[model samples]
Target chain A: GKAVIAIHGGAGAISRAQMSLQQELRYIEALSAIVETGQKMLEAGESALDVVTEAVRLLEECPLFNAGIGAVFTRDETHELDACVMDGNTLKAGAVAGVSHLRNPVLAARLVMEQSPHVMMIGEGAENFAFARGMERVSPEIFSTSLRYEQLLAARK
Target chain B: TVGAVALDLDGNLAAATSTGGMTNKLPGRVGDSPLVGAGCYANNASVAVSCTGTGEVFIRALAAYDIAALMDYGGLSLAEACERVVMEKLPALGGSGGLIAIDHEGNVALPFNTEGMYRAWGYAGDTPTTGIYR
Candidate 1:
């Protein structure tokens, strides 16, 4: 009857030389912080879906990881985010892809799972749905960071 | 940069995954990360899985669901299923990524072919553990 949770930041060609010690510490700290938040909620008897969504929300917002605020750029120098959430008990799920404006794509995904009959929504439609549902909106510029932009520029070479 | 699988005290299992897709990825290119079977799968009946890797390869292999199917149908253990799917099957197909899985019995497996993956796991009453290499 024990409770457990596991999480991963995206996986790719991360190298030590590429990530400075300070930056590494920031990522580590962010990961640990989100886990602590979720663990505490789980201990208080929250549902698995709730804890997982909230945990991912934190990650999505942090500029250090590649989900929400720190999301990578597409070829056009714009950010198109994707996220999904599932309830294991009910087998209900929601996902949003290519959304360019939502602050937290996971929140919209959870909303789709909870409020709408559909399981997935994309791009502008996803944005409209989340907005109509009272989810927060932000400019795509909010997702842009110097570090990510720099990476994109470097990749162009 | 995100995926998670959990087993609650109520014996429920849940898996979730989120990512920015890939750096410098082509616009409109959806990867396995947002696909239910490819990126994440969870069921109280069997196991929960979250994957991180090349979207195309994972999608082709049905990466997340394959692990659960192996356990549900092939009767493989959590670790064995993970190894077969992540280390053998997916790799054989030229897929290089990893996944975290948790079965109904609270067993855990973190497997990846890549040199490094950002990962972490923990249970109630224990501090969460995290690592970035191997």
Candidate 2:
């Protein structure tokens, strides 16, 4: 049972012009850190389900990506984060969408798969479910950042 | 704005995707990220896939599931199916971005039509690798 893992931060019209070499290195460094530990876990006999969930949860925690604490704002100038996790063995899946108060929406998604008998949950209902399911709750301000604010403003103009 | 696909020592497959959705998007606007087949899909029998970029178009293409379908049903190899979808189908629908996938045999494919995709991968006995620009 050989193990393998892969991840992505995002994709778009990103080129050399948009990202400085130093900035690119930073992203690589970040991704490398996450994948390296994850590789160790997989080799240590961790489950693929656990590895994928932990990796995505770590990605959500990193503000360098538009997720979790670094999620972008909606048109209403608030965050609506989304996440999902699926186990190929069982085809059992869970997802959370438009949730704004969970520290790690991926965790909430996992709960949806294991706890509740639901595949997807959204917005107020999702946030409420998270808290009820023992998920950590955070303020919307925690998901906000000056960098993301600037992007929000730039998009408006 | 992120996704992961993994294969464990037990040979099980799993995929996870997380996103901030679109910046300045209408509230409640869902993207492929939260959908099972569009942005994320995993099966021990085929492949585990996770996608990024133009969520709407990815949804239309059923990007993640389509790749699995190609390999399982269409009999396309891992690399062939990825190229057909990420390079051909996605672009035809005016879609951009890419995906990361792992096949049953532990083969890997990271394909995208955009100028760049923030990505990384690693195997059980090796160090991790990262990429950004095409």
Candidate 3:
């Protein structure tokens, strides 16, 4: 029974001068925790589909990452999220983009994979699909974090 | 952006990726993270890949599928194909960021042209190994 899981929070030219020791620890802990969670699920004999779905759902819930719940701001100061999930066994895949209402975009992506005959969906269309299928609505304002807000201001300057 | 690639007890592979896109990006802009074959792909015949980077560049290169294809049709090992895509091809198009992949043989690769990528991997009965900077 060989099972493995790997994940990335993002990639960039991150610099030591840009982060404090505590900030680094926060990211490290979050990443490790999610990996640990996925491993346990795998060890418990979950499918690869369930493994990534749950792992990424947790990552989205964490405020440290630029994903579902803590998405970065658009130029218009809106939060638009995107997610994709694929099943290697069947090559069945689903993706959603330009969405903000769904709390966990990964869940919707999977739903689209199983419930629909399509591979990708976007904008309000994706939102309606998820909503009709029982995804809870999360206000866009909740996706706004002071940290991301500051990052936007700094980038604009 | 955040992403995952996993191999389960049934020997099936799966990949997932999620992101908010670039900070200050325009509305309705779609990153590779939401594009199949570009940012995420899986096939039991080869590997499962999830990519994070200049989304457009990854889309242009079809980054995730390239690795699986190199291994499936081109006969490259997991590390070799991953390196060629993440290192050679991505940079050739002025892209940065990284990706995580796991093959059918259980080999895993994490490669990025940038200074670092927030990454972790492991199996049952052990804490997942972790990394950040180069």
Candidate 4:
């Protein structure tokens, strides 16, 4: 079966002045890398759900983008992440918002779809669900990056 | 900038979206990205859509599902539905952002009122393409 995939890091005010050549190249590479990986899985006849979750997990792990590890800081200097996955074939969807400790919120979202009966979970409750499900757990500090920290400091000003 | 919509050869459609939310956004502020019908919507019957932009506005407009509705009910083409939803309805409601969609027919649409959006797309057996900026 033919398959296609698309990804976005975020859409907002981005300019050459705000992004360095190295940074731009890194983003391009990251985006392309995920696409390539996903294309292989799809071509191999992997389910769309599997391809999308795994591809999104890769993006979540990369600190160069504003997700997972590179997530932006909240007004209170905390990182609150959100992710969701849906199976178009079944229209079954799962989502988690404001989670702080799950390494890959997308994975947690996938679990919510396959494990629990709920459609969305938030904050510490979602984290607890992941822990109970035996999903990989991480310290919130792992998500903190110098780039995002700088942005937080600047936002505070 | 993180969303994806796909159509498999089996004619199934899937859409997914993820974000760190807005930069410096309020704590616990949930955006349209994680909300199924707003920031992302997919069904084998119609189309798959993933949206990015001002979360609040997209939520109010039910942006993603509206595109599907336009195609299913209004009989608009995939591209036309996307333009009406992203280019017309969103701005009329004071929202600015973009979306990428793929219909069951394997058609694609990337539309944004913003200056630019990080986007990429590719089909099986072809090299994927990524782009940003206007």
Residues A58-109, model 4: lDDT tens digits = 9999998888988888888788999989887755667788888899999998
Candidate 2, residue B119: CA error in Å? 48
What DockQ does predicted model 3 obtain? 0.05
What CAPRI grade goes to candidate 4?
A: incorrect
Top candidate, metric TM-score? 3
Question: Is 2 or 3 the stronger prediction by TM-score?
Answer: 3
Winner on DockQ between 1 and 2 is: 2
Clashes of each: 2, 1, 0, 5
- The C-alpha TM-scores of every prediction are 0.56, 0.56, 0.57, 0.56
lDDT per residue (tens digit) for residues A1-157 in model 1: 4997888888989899977999889889999999999999999999999999999999888888888887888899999998888887855667788898899989998987788755667888788888889987889988889989998999999
The residue ranges of model 3 lying beyond 4 angstroms of the native Cα positions read B1-134
Candidate 2 residues lying further than 4 Å off, grouped into runs, are: B1-134
lDDT of 4 at A35: 91
lDDT of 3 by residue, B1-134 (tens): 99999999899999999998778754444668977999999999999999988876687678999999999899999999988998898887677888999999889989998988999999867688999998
lDDT of predicted model 2: 0.87
Give stretches of model 1 more than 4 Å off.
B1-134
- Cα error, residue B14 of model 2, in Å, equals 33
Instruction: Give the higher-lDDT candidate: 3 or 4.
Output: 3
Clashing residue pairs, candidate 2? B1-B19
- Tell me how each candidate scores on DockQ against the true complex: 0.03, 0.04, 0.05, 0.04
